[PDB]
């Protein structure tokens, strides 16, 4: 299918203000270590004042913090979700299906991803590298997409509708009982991975 409007609206969304793109990649690489990330640690990596770092993060309303005020969730998260995302010996989680497909290229590591079909509850898993996916089980795995909304919180308007399914038929059956959700579409995990690749290329083509 035609992916340009998905890529465009997703890109538009992360350019909240200048900073997000350039903050996003180091933050993900820190979260991938499996521990909470301090605002000062980010500042060291970015060479920004911590208050600039906070100014970027305050625009991102779904950012998760722990009891110590450290960052534990931003696309990748230490707080349990349906999308398990393991790097090395650390279990991490992700906000949605497409996240799991995108973030391995950004952090430069292969991830072991596992979830459950949102229609049937069947387990699903794959290995996601910066350049390819492997071990897709079951092989006909599918992904739901919706159109992101620009000024909406990305987690509540996009991530919460973007799931893994055991198969395209299963997913399409499920989709026929959702309506009004703008841009709802079912694709194979391969097409979603390709989507994530175009997204990343565009997003990286515009950092410092």
Report the nearest approach of Hg ion to the CB of residue 98 (Å). 6
Residue nearest to Hg ion (CB): 159
Q: Where in 70-89 is the site for Hg ion (CB under 5 A)? A: none
| Partner whose footprint covers residue 100, from Br ion, Hg ion, none (CB < 5 to 8 Å by kind) | none
Please state the closest distance from residue 83 (CB atom) to Hg ion, in A.
Answer: 9
Q: With CB under 5 A as the contact rule, which of the stretches 35-43, 90-98, 120-128, 165-173 interacts with Hg ion?
A: 90-98
- Residues 69/162/128/11 CA torsion (nearest 10 deg): -70
99: contact with Hg ion by CB under 5 A: yes
Report helix angle 189-204 to 97-107, nearest 10.
50
**Part in contact with Hg ion (CB under 5 A); list of ranges 30-38, 66-74, 105-113, 152-160:** 152-160
* Contact present, 90 and 34 (Cβ < 8 Å): yes
By CB under 5 A, name the binding residues for Br ion.
Answer: 2, 4
Of 7, 28, 96, 192, the one binding Hg ion (CB under 5 A) is 96
Q: Which stretch binds Hg ion (CB under 5 A): 24-32, 84-92, 99-107, 164-172?
A: 99-107
According to the binding rule CB under 5 A, does residue 10 interact with Hg ion?
no
Q: How far is the CB of 44 from Br ion (least distance, A)?
A: 41
Indicate which single residue of 76, 106, 145, 159 sits in contact with Hg ion (rule: CB under 5 A).
159
CB 72 within 8 A of CB 64: yes
- Among Br ion, Hg ion, none, residue 4 binds (CB under 5-8 Å by kind): Br ion
Q: Which residues bind Hg ion (CB under 5 A)?
A: 95-96, 99, 159
């Amino acid at each position: 299918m035609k992916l340009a409007p998905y890529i465009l609206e997703l890109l538009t969304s992360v350019n909240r203000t200048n900073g997000t793109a350039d903050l996003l990649v180091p933050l993900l690489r820190e979260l991938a270590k499996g521990r909470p990330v301090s605002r000062t640690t980010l500042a060291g990596i970015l060479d920004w004042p911590a208050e600039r770092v906070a100014a970027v993060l305050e625009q991102a309303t779904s950012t998760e913090y722990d009891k110590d005020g450290n960052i534990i969730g931003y696309g990748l998260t230490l707080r349990e979700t349906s999308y398990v995302f393991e790097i090395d010996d650390r279990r991490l989680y992700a906000w949605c299906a497409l996240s799991t497909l995108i973030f391995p290229a950004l952090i430069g590591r292969t991830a072991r991803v596992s979830s459950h079909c949102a229609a049937t509850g069947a387990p699903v898993s794959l290995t996601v590298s910066p350049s390819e996916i492997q071990a897709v089980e079951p092989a006909g795995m599918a992904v739901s997409l919706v159109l992101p909304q620009e000024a909406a919180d990305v987690r509540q308007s996009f991530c919460c509708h973007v799931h893994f399914f055991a198969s395209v038929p299963t997913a399409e059956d499920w989709a026929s009982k959702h309506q009004g959700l703008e841009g709802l579409a079912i694709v194979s995990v391969h097409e979603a991975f390709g989507l994530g690749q175009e997204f990343n290329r565009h997003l990286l083509q515009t950092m410092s």
